């Protein structure tokens, strides 16, 4: 009955947008375990760009979020079939092609972003 | 057995500091209900100063925090004996004199801040 959901991300300067996506992932089925993967500082820099918070900071903040049952920190940059078997993951939840193989397997669940609520957008707000 | 704890605050741009205080309040006893009071936009401005986020935004973010069982939004600026009876509150938890009457009654539990982890401190970090 219990369904294992995996959501990965940088989770830099966690904001309501991230929180809503985690909520959505958690609530995909009636009984879930939400595992959250937090990306390493080096791979995030190499593959994405600037990260403000350290892995420790990003991970520690996620611990306080209601929807998070387990954290993998650091997580792999790229999800593999071996990773899913290792952690007994039933679905991967992410914003929506590197996820084609997951969709082909029936193991992909889309979740939605929220614009405007960003931590950086809040500073853009204040300046006046 | 279940102990009702009340923590109030502005909770503007919620950060690890706030989250740790809420955790501390929640864990004061083995079985607790943590009620969190979120201050109104006008009273925060009048009595404290600038608030970046609206009451709705501050309240919505707190909903996602593991330790929060109930929210009173807006909450009164000043705690009263009548308020404690109304919500069946056993202890008030806050950083540590407007709380003298609570300490005299045995209804005050100190919780600690964390400096450096602030949302604004993180912007102070990045600029370089
Ligand atoms: C590649 N990755 C999925 C592990 C990290 C990027 O995820 P995200 O922060 O864009 O949601
Ligand atoms: C007066 N008050 C306690 C309701 C709001 C101020 O609380 P805080 O944000 O300084 O912890």
Neighbours of B120 (CB within 10 A): 13
Cis bond leading into B74, ω under 30°? Answer: yes
* Helix or strand run (H / E) with residue A16: helix A16-26
DSSP characters for A97-119? -TTHHHHHHT-EEE----SS--H
d(CA B105, CA B95): 17
Pick one of 3.40.120.10, 3.90.600.10, 3.10.129.10, 3.40.50.620 as the CATH number of B1-128.
3.40.50.620
From residue B124, give the alpha-carbon distance in Å to each of A123, B33, B81, B98, B120: 12, 36, 41, 32, 6
A65·B60 Cβ contact <8 A = no
Instruction: Choose among B85, B90, B13, B2: nearest CA to B44.
Output: B13
Structural domain boundaries in chain A: 1-128
| Strand partners of residue A3 | A32
From residue B65, give the alpha-carbon distance in Å to each of A71, A122, B58, B59, B60: 16, 19, 12, 11, 10
d(CA B121, CA B116): 6
Report DSSP state, residue B38: E
Q: Are B127 and B27 in contact (CB under 8 A)?
A: no
Chain A hits for B68, Cβ within 8 Å: 66
A10 assigned to a ligand binding site: yes
- DSSP β-ladder status, A91-94 and A70-75: unpaired
Q: Enumerate residues 6+ apart whose C-beta is below 8 A from A30.
A: A1
This structure's resolution (Å) is: 1.8
* Helix or strand run (H / E) with residue A93: strand A91-94
């Amino acid at each position: 009955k219990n369904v294992v959901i995996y959501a990965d991300g940088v989770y830099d300067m966690l904001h309501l947008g991230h929180m809503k996506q985690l909520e959505q992932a958690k609530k995909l089925f009636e009984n879930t375990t939400l595992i959250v993967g937090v990306t390493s500082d080096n791979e995030t820099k190499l593959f994405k760009g600037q990260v403000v918070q350290t892995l420790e900071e990003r991970t520690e903040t996620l611990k306080h979020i209601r929807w998070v049952d387990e954290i993998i920190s650091p997580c792999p940059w790229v999800v593999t079939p071996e990773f899913l078997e290792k952690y007994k993951i039933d679905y991967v939840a992410h914003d929506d092609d590197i996820y084609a193989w997951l969709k082909r397997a029936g193991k992909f669940k889309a979740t939605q972003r929220t614009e405007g609520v960003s931590t950086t957008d809040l500073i853009v707000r204040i300046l006046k």
